[PDB]
Paper text:
Rspo (R-spondin, also roof plate-specific spondin) proteins are evolutionarily conserved from fish to humans and have well-documented roles in a broad range of developmental and physiological processes resulting from enhancement of canonical and non-canonical Wnt signalling. Direct extracellular interaction with Rspo proteins inhibits [name]/[name] activity.
The ZNRF3ecto crystal structures revealed a distinctive variant of the protease-associated domain topology. The resultant single-domain structure is relatively compact. Comparisons of ZNRF3ecto structures for proteins crystallized in several different crystal lattices, or for crystals containing multiple copies in the asymmetric unit, consistently highlighted an acidic region (N105-E114; residue numbering is for mouse sequences unless otherwise stated) within the β3–β4 loop, the short αC–β7 loop and the extended β1–β2 hairpin as flexible elements of the fold.
Author numbering:
A (entry chain B): 30 to 80, 88 to 181
B (entry chain A): 30 to 80, 87 to 181
């Protein structure tokens, strides 16, 4: 099922009102996690960063070439789990560089997380990084329709 | 339609992890805002307080006054919802227990709906909501369309 991800940039206009810009993106809900909507501020994690942020962040993790990390500290599902335990309301992996991560997550072996675990690639990941990379405050609204 | 609201208390466990306690509550989405999901930190707002910056993305909770308490209200209850979004609310949850007439007003159809959810809660759920909000600091609201 498709995860409709809205990524919102924001600047507090001087008087308290917010100026925002929204970009709508898409990934899929993995079997590894729940298929629910979720939302919160984006934290960009390095994939090795998962071996205190305020509760309810949306982890964004750009996975790396499998041959960069030969004996990885955890499985990609393990990494997501650790994120949640550390207060993530959702995890979005950019699997552009680790396309086999997908089959690994959808392997349906452990029963799922109660939070979403979304995978993104191609154009949408590029845009997700285009935004994340440049702006401190960005918000993710992950929507199951 | 029903708004399925999970309120989550939380505090850090001594090792980086979070200990949490979750409470599932219900309200309805009103025609004044979308019927979508939304999540964020609760900010309890006095109803007269929509007439100081908050981190974008908060879920405002507003317990409405007995109508005879506010004779000259700065805004319609939809106006306060709308003002809250503009100040970075991701959703508004009104406790309507003391002002049941606000429901009919919120569902009026007259103005465009907000792109954010505007939920109302009453009776028991709202009690349970304020029970958590008034005591607990560090409360996250997850509002869910199913």
């Amino acid at each position: 099922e498709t995860a409709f991800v809205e990524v919102v940039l924001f600047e507090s206009s001087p008087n308290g009102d917010y100026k925002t810009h929204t970009t709508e993106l898409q990934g899929r809900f993995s079997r590894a996690g729940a298929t629910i909507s979720a939302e919160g501020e984006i934290v960009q994690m390095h994939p090795l960063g998962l071996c205190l942020y305020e509760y309810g962040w949306v982890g964004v993790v750009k996975l790396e070439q499998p041959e960069m990390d030969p004996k990885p500290c955890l499985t990609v599902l393990g990494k997501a789990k650790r994120a949640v335990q550390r207060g993530a309301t959702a995890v979005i992996f950019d699997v552009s560089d680790n396309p086999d991560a997908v089959e690994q997550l959808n392997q349906g072996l452990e029963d799922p997380l109660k939070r979403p675990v979304v995978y993104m690639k191609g154009m949408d990941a590029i845009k997700l990084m285009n935004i994340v990379n440049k702006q401190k405050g960005a918000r993710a609204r992950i929507q199951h329709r």
